[PDB]
Design a protein around this ligand. Structure first.
Ligand SMILES: CCO/N=C1/CN(C(=O)N[C@H](CC)c2ccc(C(=O)O)cc2)C(=O)[C@H](Cc2cc(Cl)ccc2OC)CN1
Ligand SMILES: *[C@@H]1O[C@H](CO)[C@@H](O)[C@H](O)[C@H]1NC(C)=O
Ligand SMILES: *[C@@H]1O[C@H](CO)[C@@H](O)[C@H](O)[C@H]1NC(C)=O
Ligand SMILES: [Zn+2]
Length: 220
């Protein structure tokens, strides 16, 4: 997160920290969020050979009793996820066990331009800075779809256009998959933007994918 501030520890108990294993490189990281005691929502571009999820974290380098580290048994990447157009950037992760409900760990159960929303993550705090140790958050403006025109594949039915171009606030590398909360409901998921972090950025519009989400959760 660029231009944000450190979150009050454990104030976003649905936040998931994802470590992504691939077979040919070192580990990568994404955010995500707990929608059911055994399901994490995140971005399809976070998929890999295997993933481990840490719940209950604030400072990701300092183990504490709030931590729940859980194995992912299956990844359900959206079947239409397209690496050319970048549409349908969404994935469910099924956890091996049900997470415990604690002060630090809970679910986040289930919109037009103008509204201020919040995003949170452990990602880079600058173009050339490392990922944050601690969970950071920022407030971002929802924009009219026109503000995202220069993303040629942007589609207002599937995606939200997020961040006032006059400000430097943005999600960045490592924040992928994290929720956009507007009035305490998750409305989007960090998807993509410019390499230089100049806003706005493109978030997956969660309402369009609700039938798909329900179908996976009911069959599992
Ligand atoms: C639809 C496909 O979208 N692809 C990406 C690229 N991307 C990654 O590939 N991230 C991997 C994790 C899967 C990654 C790579 C490097 C690092 C690092 O810290 O170097 C962290 C995570 C990302 O992390 C991007 C982060 C990001 C978010 C926004 Cl909102 C704006 C710009 C931006 O990156 C330049 C998001 N999307
Ligand atoms: C996170 O925890 C580590 C190990 O305790 C500590 O060195 C580091 O300063 C912490 N980072 C913070 C609070 O930003
Ligand atoms: C991705 O989308 C483009 C345009 O919609 C399409 O031509 C392509 O077949 C889709 N599938 C893949 C596998 O990229
Ligand atoms: Zn704690």
């Amino acid at each position: 997160i660029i231009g944000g501030t450190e979150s009050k520890p454990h104030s976003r108990p649905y936040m998931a920290y994802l470590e992504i294993v691939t077979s040919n490189g070192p580990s990568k990281f994404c955010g995500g969020f707990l929608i059911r005691r055994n399901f994490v929502l995140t971005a399809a571009h976070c998929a890999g050979r295997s993933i481990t999820v840490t719940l209950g974290a604030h400072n990701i380098t300092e183990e504490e009793d709030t931590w729940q580290k859980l194995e992912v048994i299956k990844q359900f990447r959206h079947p239409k996820y397209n690496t050319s157009t970048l549409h349908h950037d969404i994935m469910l992760l099924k956890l091996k066990e049900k997470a415990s409900l604690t002060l630090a760990v809970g679910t986040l159960p289930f919109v037009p331009p103008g509204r201020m929303c919040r995003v949170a993550g452990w990602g880079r705090t600058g173009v050339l800075k490392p990922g944050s140790d601690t969970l950071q958050e920022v407030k971002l403006r929802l924009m009219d779809p026109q503000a995202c025109s220069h993303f040629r594949d942007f589609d207002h039915n599937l995606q939200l256009c997020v961040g006032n171009p006059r400000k430097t606030k943005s999600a960045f590398k490592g924040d992928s998959g994290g929720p956009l909360l507007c009035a305490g409901v998750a409305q989007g998921i960090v998807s993509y933007g410019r390499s230089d972090a100049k806003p706005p950025a493109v978030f997956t519009r969660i309402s369009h994918y609700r039938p798909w989400i329900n179908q996976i959760l009911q069959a599992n």
